Amino acid sequence: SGFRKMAFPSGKVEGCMVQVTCGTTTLNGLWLDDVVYCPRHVICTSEDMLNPNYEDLLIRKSNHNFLVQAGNVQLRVIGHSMQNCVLKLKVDTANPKTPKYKFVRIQPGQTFSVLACYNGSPSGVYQCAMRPNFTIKGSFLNGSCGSVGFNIDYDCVSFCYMHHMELPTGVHAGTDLEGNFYGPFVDRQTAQAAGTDTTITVNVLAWLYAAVINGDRWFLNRFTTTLNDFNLVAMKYNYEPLTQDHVDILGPLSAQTGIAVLDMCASLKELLQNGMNGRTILGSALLEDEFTPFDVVRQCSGVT
Amino acid sequence: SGFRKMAFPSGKVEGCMVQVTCGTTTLNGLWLDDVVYCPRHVICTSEDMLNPNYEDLLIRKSNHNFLVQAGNVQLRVIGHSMQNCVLKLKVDTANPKTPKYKFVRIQPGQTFSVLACYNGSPSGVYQCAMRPNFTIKGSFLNGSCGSVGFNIDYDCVSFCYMHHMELPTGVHAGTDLEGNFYGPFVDRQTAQAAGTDTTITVNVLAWLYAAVINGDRWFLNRFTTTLNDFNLVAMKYNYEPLTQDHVDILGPLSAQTGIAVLDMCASLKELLQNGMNGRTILGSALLEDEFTPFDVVRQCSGVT
Ligand SMILES: *CC(=O)N1CCN(Cc2cccs2)CC1
Numbered sequence: 001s002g003f004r005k006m007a008f009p010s011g012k013v014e015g016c017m018v019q020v021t022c023g024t025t026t027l028n029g030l031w032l033d034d035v036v037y038c039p040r041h042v043i044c045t046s047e048d049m050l051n052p053n054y055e056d057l058l059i060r061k062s063n064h065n066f067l068v069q070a071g072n073v074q075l076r077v078i079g080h081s082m083q084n085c086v087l088k089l090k091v092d093t094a095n096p097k098t099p100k101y102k103f104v105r106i107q108p109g110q111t112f113s114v115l116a117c118y119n120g121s122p123s124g125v126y127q128c129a130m131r132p133n134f135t136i137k138g139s140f141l142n143g144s145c146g147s148v149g150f151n152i153d154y155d156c157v158s159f160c161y162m163h164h165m166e167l168p169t170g171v172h173a174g175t176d177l178e179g180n181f182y183g184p185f186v187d188r189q190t191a192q193a194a195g196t197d198t199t200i201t202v203n204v205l206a207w208l209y210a211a212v213i214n215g216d217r218w219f220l221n222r223f224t225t226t227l228n229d230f231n232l233v234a235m236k237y238n239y240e241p242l243t244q245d246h247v248d249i250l251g252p253l254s255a256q257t258g259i260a261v262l263d264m265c266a267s268l269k270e271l272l273q274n275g276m277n278g279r280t281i282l283g284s285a286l287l288e289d290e291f292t293p294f295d296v297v298r299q300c301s302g303v304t
Numbered sequence: 305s306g307f308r309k310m311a312f313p314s315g316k317v318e319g320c321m322v323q324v325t326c327g328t329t330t331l332n333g334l335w336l337d338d339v340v341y342c343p344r345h346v347i348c349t350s351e352d353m354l355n356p357n358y359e360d361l362l363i364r365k366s367n368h369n370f371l372v373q374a375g376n377v378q379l380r381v382i383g384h385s386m387q388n389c390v391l392k393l394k395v396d397t398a399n400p401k402t403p404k405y406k407f408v409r410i411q412p413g414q415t416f417s418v419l420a421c422y423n424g425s426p427s428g429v430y431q432c433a434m435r436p437n438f439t440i441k442g443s444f445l446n447g448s449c450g451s452v453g454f455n456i457d458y459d460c461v462s463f464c465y466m467h468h469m470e471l472p473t474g475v476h477a478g479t480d481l482e483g484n485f486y487g488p489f490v491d492r493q494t495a496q497a498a499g500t501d502t503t504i505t506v507n508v509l510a511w512l513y514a515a516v517i518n519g520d521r522w523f524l525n526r527f528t529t530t531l532n533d534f535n536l537v538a539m540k541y542n543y544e545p546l547t548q549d550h551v552d553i554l555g556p557l558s559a560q561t562g563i564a565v566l567d568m569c570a571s572l573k574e575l576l577q578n579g580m581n582g583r584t585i586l587g588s589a590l591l592e593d594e595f596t597p598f599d600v601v602r603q604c605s606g607v608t
């Protein structure tokens with residue numbers, strides 16, 4: 001028992017982190033097979049970041065200008081190309097620690113682990129979610145760019161995020177491993193404001209199921225609701241509308257606990273309207289929305 | 305910017321996890337050099353757990369009865385001994401992935417990362433603190449015992465915890481790597497109740513400093529207090545008394561932010577007496593106490 005914000009074991013990803021330096025700029029790169037992936041803004045000076053023309057800036061860079069270092073050993077760059085907002089640096093050596101991997105582009109509401117790195121060296125691992133406004137709430141200082149987000153399915157790492165930017169509001173923006181940003185963000189030092197950070201309703205319900213499984217049951221009530229009635233309340237509280245697809249995904253949690261999804265919706269509706277009244281659920285005083293239904297099942301069953 | 309509950313990268317510890325089976329019982333073991341460490345309750349049947357006499361039960365076990373498997377390869381057990389509540393199984397092969405390591409016994413208030421494992425296989429990593437009542441609030445199902453808690457200082461892993469038990473209240477108890485339990489807990493299926501889970505005051509203040517560094521400043525007020533005045537409030541709210549040692553440890557955070565430790569104490573005092581009023585600090589609606597002053601400095605500076 002017990003329920004924690006848990007990240008995937010990071011070892012498989014630690015074996016892929018390298019340092020990439022171009023001129024005076026240093027960030028992280030992801031070494032998979034004979035390719036090192038990194039944000040294209042590694043070619044920029046802080047002055048270039050104002051209105052960069054990446055294709056033009058890249059013309060002034062040759063293979064020998066990209067310094068790639070894995071631990072204390074240098075990798076030889078034999079090619080470079082730009083794909084959207086990432087650079088792909090072909091090196092002459094395949095990463096011997098390359099795990100089974102995939103590049104996936106996640107949807108908002110999906111969670112992942114981040115291995116925050118500086119100078120190609122891992123500093124820590126934490127769990128994130130792709131917010132409905134396509135930002136993530138991470139922990140990233142200067143030098144952390146190129147750190148990646150991932151999920152693991154037994155022995156295959158699905159990389160889903162690469163860190164590129166911090167908005168003036170302290171929230172983060174990045175790309176998938178094809179270099180396409182999540183949301184409307186651009187790799188430029190300009191005014192970029194995030195939209196409404198709505199709450200991921202299906203995740204809150206999954207977390208309420210985890211609370212019941214782990215003994216926290218005070219919030220269970222004698223009520224039920226419908227999807228349409230619940231959604232009137234979800235609209236008022238800036239929660240994502242709940243769909244039948246979300247109800248279907250909560251099926252296994254409903255089956256395990258014996259609590260119908262719409263009854264859990266009614267508990268969530270009372271929690272939104274009445275508040276917590278100074279009480280906690282799984283050690284939290286707010287409704288947690290960065291656990292998906294799959295994360296709850298995984299943690300509650302002990303998948304390795 | 306951004307501040308997250310961050311665990312250490314787990315790779316160094318993943319390389320040490322093995323499965324240990326004795327009879328019909330399977331849990332995790334920690335393989336360092338040619339020794340595998342695991343909870344001594346691996347020798348028990350659920351029936352033995354009621355009132356086990358470990359020295360007597362161990363007499364019926366020989367080296368060949370301890371099945372140790374690292375991945376899909378079996379390790380040969382050439383010796384076994386009991387040290388307090390852990391068994392040390394000497395194997396004929398040194399773990400080639402043994403990192404630089406130390407065994408440390410932590411104090412309450414200290415934080416650490418847990419690599420939750422099942423059948424010697426890592427499932428996830430999360431951050432914990434040794435509570436003032438010597439329990440930890442983890443996420444551990446049957447089979448998770450033998451999972452370890454650790455801190456890393458650059459390339460040396462300091463192992464501080466090994467999972468052994470879950471109390472009826474859903475909280476966890478375990479030992480250091482010498483087999484001595486934290487607190488008064490015993491490895492027996494008996495009535496064991498935890499004492500008051502008081503809040504780690506110095507950790508809350510460190511986290512308030514992290515909030516100011518990361519932009520959350522609404523709780524800063526025009527007041528100050530003394531250690532004795534603050535402690536009258538800390539007593540009322542089940543917070544640990546603050547000492548001059550704690551004030552000294554907060555020195556670097558005070559220096560960085562320009563906020564005197566006693567002024568931050570006064571902010572915390574108002575937060576305790578007035579509550580949050582529906583507001584949040586670093587995405588939390590309660591005062592977080594599982595970040596030490598050292599964790600805050602580490603995360604805010606990017607130590608790898
Ligand atoms: C994440 C990180 O390391 N940095 C340093 C480089 N910086 C370049 C810029 C991208 C957009 C505007 S400036 C991003 C943050």
Ligand SMILES: *CC(=O)N1CCN(Cc2cccs2)CC1
Binds near residue numbers: 491
């Ligand atoms: C943590 C874990 O794997 N388990 C299974 C074995 N169980 C034995 C007992 C220890 C004290 C009472 S029963 C502990 C939990």
